[PDB]
Amino acid sequence: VAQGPNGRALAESMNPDLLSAIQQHISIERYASVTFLAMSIWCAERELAGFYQFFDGEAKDEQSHAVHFTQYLIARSQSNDLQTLDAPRQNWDSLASLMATAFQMEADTTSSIQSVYALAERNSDTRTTVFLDPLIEAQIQSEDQFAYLLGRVKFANGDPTALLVIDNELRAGQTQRG
Amino acid sequence: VAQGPNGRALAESMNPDLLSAIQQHISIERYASVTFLAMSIWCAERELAGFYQFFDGEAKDEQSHAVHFTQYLIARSQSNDLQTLDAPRQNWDSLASLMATAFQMEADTTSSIQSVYALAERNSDTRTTVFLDPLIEAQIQSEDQFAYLLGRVKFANGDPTALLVIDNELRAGQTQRG
Amino acid sequence: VAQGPNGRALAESMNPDLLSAIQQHISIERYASVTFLAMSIWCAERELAGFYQFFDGEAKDEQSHAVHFTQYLIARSQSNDLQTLDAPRQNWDSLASLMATAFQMEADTTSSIQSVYALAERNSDTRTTVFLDPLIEAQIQSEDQFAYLLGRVKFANGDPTALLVIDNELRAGQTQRG
Amino acid sequence: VAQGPNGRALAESMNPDLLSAIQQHISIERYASVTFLAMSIWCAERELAGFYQFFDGEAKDEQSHAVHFTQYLIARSQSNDLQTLDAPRQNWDSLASLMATAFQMEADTTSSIQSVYALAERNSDTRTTVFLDPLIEAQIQSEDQFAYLLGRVKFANGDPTALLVIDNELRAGQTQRG
Ligand SMILES: [Fe+3]
Ligand SMILES: [Fe+3]
Ligand SMILES: [Fe+3]
Ligand SMILES: [Fe+3]
Ligand SMILES: [Fe+3]
């Protein structure tokens, strides 16, 4: 039995480019998490308590996604490499602008998973493509959800009354088309 | 015992014009269903999640009405003839315009039942008039309901804040005067 | 943030050939639904109440599959295009012949999903291949189920006594190998 | 306040032809009842226990329908006139022949209600047409049910094995398409 780079028994070697891409994607998930924390704070500073609670939970969810990836590397007997985390964006001129950033970031997280997916396919690493399939499925749902939140906020057209109504929706947990 | 056109035992022959009118009305109900599906989609595309859920259920209800009519033809030992279904309308400039189409379509469905009703009366087919009576009763309630939804949306006068409030009403199942 | 063709925020553009293929497959699912309705009616006309109830539920299931696809296009910020629906086949010389059509139609629905799948792979649209994976899984089960129903009906060799026994199985919900 | 022919206070006089037609229809319902009793006996004599139990209940149901009509005449302050009841048919060459008679008799009971209905319409007696509407509705269901039972028995093509299976269906209460 061979030993993997992290010292565990090795079921199948992983190409170093694919390992590096996964380690990078983990940073992408951790960065999404701290970004959602920053967004939570921005909403709290403006008394948008529903949006604050929503993003507080999103930050914890994204961190869970990052950890899920670290567990996969452990299972593949590959080394993790937790990287320096950049500071998040912390300033927006409007809630609509913030939600645009939030949606774009979810789409960018999917684009990163897609890049890892294509590299695994190039390497014929079907453990990795199988591992990623449900994560892409969850990204489709998150993209649908953040498109809904963004579109609803833009529908409000900057009217505080409408934004308070949506804020109360989010506080109640009404965060998707359903 | 005589055999009906669909092969079952025949309790009472039906005039071919009345059969044809019922088969046509079934198409009217199926078309209302796919129209409500189209309307569900239009609302979903604009993040009006309550209206989307409302029309999603309406589409399924109208299909049930259509099937109910196919069961009546079976019970009368008459042949069904499921027809080509036209594509629904799929584009509206506003929610108020969509709700106008929805109300007019319900009224038109009643007008079709009324035409079948008058033909049955001309033919003295009291099985059919009895069969239709509760369906007209349900149409009165649906006409009242869609007049309420249309009038409430027009009351909002195109203000997104008001439309979000009504959207949340529909998501909660508050869809009638009550 | 870019806007998709249906107006929502766009996570990833879709190739117009792939969009067109999905819209077409939705028609395939809607056509399977109305075909199962027609089959439900044919069985009801011959007092095969178990087969009638089975196909009545199948028709509703296929419609749900069609709607599931419309939701995916919404999630991808792509336009839906509900198409003209052709009239279903409505006449068969025997239950065995009807079940042959039913099985072939399920296989043809899978073939259509497979064509969409191959186009998504050509376009490297892994959101779509992931979205389709569980639908292919369900098609494998439906193909197994309709092969079972068809084979059991052919085993009966046209004997009404055997067909009544199978009819009662279906009424009881015994519709698979289990 | 005027007194009706049965001595009670009279809300609205009834035309003597319509009274006579209702009294006659009551005889039609009582005759259907004793006919179902005869059919119950015929099935019992041939060990068709399910059909025997089914017709035993049908006989009691038809008697209830007859009584329901006597209550309407009481409510209209009209006299009842319970008539001589003819002996039922009691001999059939086959179960299929018996079921044909049973279906024809249900259709004939509806035809009788229809004749009363047309006379009430001629007399503008809308109390009577309203009173009859749910009874026609129930006749549609009974016609559908007896067409199902007749068609299923004819499907058996005189095979005792199939007839035993249907007999067990009826004993279990599986008496309609459902
Ligand atoms: Fe994530
Ligand atoms: Fe999968
Ligand atoms: Fe309807
Ligand atoms: Fe399907
Ligand atoms: Fe009766």
DSSP one-letter string for C166-177: HHHHHHTT--S-
Q: How is residue B6 written in tokens?
A: 């669909």
Instruction: Report the residue of chain D nearest C51, measured CA to CA.
Output: D177
Residues 6+ apart with CB under 8 A from C139: C106, C109, C110, C113
Nearest to A111 by CA among D5, B58, C82, C12: C12
Give the DSSP per-residue string, C43-110. HHHTT-HHHHHHHHHHHHHHHHHHHHHHHHHHHTTPPP-PPPBPPPP---SSHHHHHHHHHHHHHHHH
Distance of CA A3 to the CA centre of its chain: 32
DSSP for residue C9:
B
Nearest to C46 by CA among A126, D10, B7: B7
CA of A70 to the centre of ligand 2 (A): 20
Give the DSSP per-residue string, chain A. -PBPTTSSB-SS---HHHHHHHHHHHHHHHHHHHHHHHHHHHHHHTT-HHHHHHHHHHHHHHHHHHHHHHHHHHHTTPPP-PPP-PPPP---SSHHHHHHHHHHHHHHHHHHHHHHHHHHHHTT-HHHHHHHHHHHHHHHHHHHHHHHHHHHHHHTTT-HHHHHHHHHHHHTT--S--
Among B38, B70, B86, select the one facing C41 at the smallest CB separation: B70
Q: How is residue D58 written in tokens?
A: 């049908």
Alpha-carbon distance of D69 to D80, in angstroms, equals 9
Among B11, B77, B131, select the one facing D110 at the smallest CB separation: B11
* Most distant CA atoms of chain C, gap in Å: 65
Q: In terms of residues, how long is chain C?
A: 178
Instruction: Please state how this structure was obtained.
Output: X-ray
List the single best residue of B43, B95, B161, B169 to mutate versus A (max A Cβ within 10 A).
Answer: B161
Neighbours of B152 (CB within 10 A): 17
Among left, alpha and beta (phi > 0; psi -120 to 50; other), residue C77 is left
CA distance C75 to chain A (A): 5
Among C46, C161, C165, select the one facing D159 at the smallest CB separation: C161
Half-sphere exposure of A81 (CA within 13 A, CB side): 11
Neighbours of D76 (CB within 10 A): 24
- Is B55 in contact with B43 (CB distance < 8 Å)? yes
- Is B102 in contact with B73 (CB distance < 8 Å)? no
Nearest to A145 by CA among C126, C26, C74: C74
The answer on whether B47 is annotated among ligand-binding residues is no
Q: In terms of residues, how long is chain A?
A: 178
Residues 6+ apart with CB under 8 A from A109: A28, A29, A32, A139
Cβ-defined contact of C171 to D176 (cutoff 8 Å): no
Alpha-carbon distance of B22 to B127, in angstroms, equals 13
Smallest-distance ligand from the CA of A28: 1
Nearest to A18 by CA among A108, A135, A137, A122: A122
Alpha-carbon distance of D51 to D65, in angstroms, equals 21
Alpha-carbon distance of D162 to D151, in angstroms, equals 13
List the single best residue of D136, D141, D154 to mutate versus B (max B Cβ within 10 A).
Answer: D136
Alpha-carbon distance of B12 to B18, in angstroms, equals 13
Q: How is residue B16 written in tokens?
A: 């071919």
CA of D105 to the centre of ligand 5 (A): 10
Q: Which amino acid is at A40?
A: S
CA distance A99 to chain B (A): 14
Q: For residue C9, list its beta bridge partners.
A: C3
List the single best residue of D146, D154, D164, D165 to mutate versus C (max C Cβ within 10 A).
Answer: D165
* Most distant CA atoms of chain B, gap in Å: 65
Q: How is residue D149 written in tokens?
A: 């039972």
Cβ-defined contact of D177 to C49 (cutoff 8 Å): yes
Nearest to A90 by CA among A57, A48, A43, A49: A43
Alpha-carbon distance of A124 to A104, in angstroms, equals 30
CA of A60 to the centre of ligand 2 (A): 25
Q: How is residue C54 written in tokens?
A: 């089975």
Q: Which amino acid is at C15?
A: N
Neighbours of C155 (CB within 10 A): 11
Q: For residue A9, list its beta bridge partners.
A: A3
Chains that touch C (3 or more CB pairs under 8 A): A, B, D
Q: Which amino acid is at B23?
A: Q
Rounded to the nearest 10°, the torsion over CA B13, B16, B22, B27 is 140
Cβ-defined contact of A143 to C11 (cutoff 8 Å): yes
- Is D14 in contact with D76 (CB distance < 8 Å)? yes
Instruction: Report the residue of chain C nearest D159, measured CA to CA.
Output: C161
Residues 6+ apart with CB under 8 A from C61: none
* Most distant CA atoms of chain D, gap in Å: 65
Binding site per annotation, positions of C for Fe(3+): 29, 62, 65, 106, 133
Smallest-distance ligand from the CA of B58: 3
Half-sphere exposure of B163 (CA within 13 A, CB side): 23
Q: For residue A165, list its beta bridge partners.
A: none
Q: Which amino acid is at B173?
A: G
Nearest to D80 by CA among D29, D134, D36: D29
Instruction: Report the residue of chain B nearest A178, measured CA to CA.
Output: B49
Alpha-carbon distance of C116 to C135, in angstroms, equals 12
What three-state secondary structure class fits D3? Answer: strand
Residues of chain A contacting residue B44, judged by C-beta atoms under 8 Å apart: 177
CA of B65 to the centre of ligand 3 (A): 5
Q: Residue A121 phi/psi, 5° resolution? A: -65, -40
Exposed e or buried b for every residue in B87-124, given b needs 16+ CB within 10 A? ebebebeebbebbbbbbebbeebbebbeebbebbeeee
10 Å CB burial of residue D73 (0-12, 13-18, 19+) is buried
- Please name the residue that has the structure tokens 């007049």: B147
CA of B31 to the centre of ligand 3 (A): 9
Nearest to D68 by CA among D124, D10, D29: D29
Alpha-carbon distance of D109 to B99, in angstroms, equals 46
- Is D173 in contact with D54 (CB distance < 8 Å)? no
Q: How is residue B96 written in tokens?
A: 């108020």
